[PDB]
Amino acid sequence: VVNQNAQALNTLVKQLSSNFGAISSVLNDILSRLDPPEAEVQIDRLITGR
Amino acid sequence: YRVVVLSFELLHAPATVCGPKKSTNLVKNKCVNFNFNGLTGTGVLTESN
Amino acid sequence: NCVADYSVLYNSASFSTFKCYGVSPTKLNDLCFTNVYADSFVIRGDEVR
């Protein structure tokens, strides 16, 4: 039971490091690079996978 | 048409080239928005061992 | 290892065709990079596209 919850929590955190097709996983990088209308395209991909 | 293509390397090494952005004093033991070498984020700054 | 100010080029109109695919033109100064390579050359008019 302890290991089961540990794997579920660990897996859930490791997904944040995945790009999900986006240029980068960090949101501050997208905001600091792409234009406002262009950032929405990348941010949508991260929200979709997350 | 004179063409010049701008290429760059991102987050593979510290930034030696940065525009005229005036630096400020450092704050500690408080939650603040910090930008260091182009790295943006919010967090409490404390001395690490 | 220098200070790159890209606002002077954006404020004063010079470049006829200026487009940034990788990053935003306004964020060039906000976010800064380590190595910057500039390939300079000249091409025929219709070859810029």
Side-chain angles (χ1 to χ4, degrees):
Chain A
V1 176
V2 176
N3 291 337
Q4 185 63 59
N5 291 336
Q7 293 177 336
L9 295 174
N10 290 336
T11 300
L12 179 63
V13 176
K14 293 176 179 177
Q15 294 299 321
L16 294 173
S17 296
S18 295
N19 290 337
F20 297 157
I23 295 169
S24 178
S25 296
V26 177
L27 296 174
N28 290 336
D29 291 344
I30 296 169
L31 296 174
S32 64
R33 294 176 64 185
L34 295 174
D35 290 343
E38 294 178 350
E40 294 178 350
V41 176
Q42 296 299 321
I43 295 169
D44 290 344
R45 294 182 181 175
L46 296 174
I47 297 169
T48 301
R50 293 181 182 175
Chain B
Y1 295 144
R2 292 181 182 175
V3 176
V4 177
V5 176
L6 178 63
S7 296
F8 60 85
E9 184 179 3
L10 174 60
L11 295 173
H12 300 289
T16 60
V17 176
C18 294
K21 302 299 183 181
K22 183 178 179 180
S23 296
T24 60
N25 290 337
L26 178 63
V27 177
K28 294 177 179 177
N29 291 337
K30 294 177 179 177
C31 183
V32 295
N33 187 339
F34 59 89
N35 187 340
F36 296 159
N37 297 130
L39 177 63
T40 301
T42 301
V44 177
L45 296 174
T46 60
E47 183 178 2
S48 179
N49 291 336
Chain C
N1 190 30
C2 55
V3 176
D5 184 3
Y6 297 136
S7 64
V8 176
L9 296 173
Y10 176 78
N11 291 336
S12 178
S14 178
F15 300 156
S16 296
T17 300
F18 177 79
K19 179 62 174 172
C20 293
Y21 297 139
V23 295
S24 178
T26 60
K27 302 299 183 181
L28 296 174
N29 290 337
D30 291 344
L31 177 63
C32 53
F33 302 152
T34 299
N35 290 283
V36 176
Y37 296 139
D39 291 344
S40 296
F41 58 89
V42 176
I43 59 173
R44 185 180 66 195
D46 61 9
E47 297 302 322
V48 64
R49 294 182 181 175

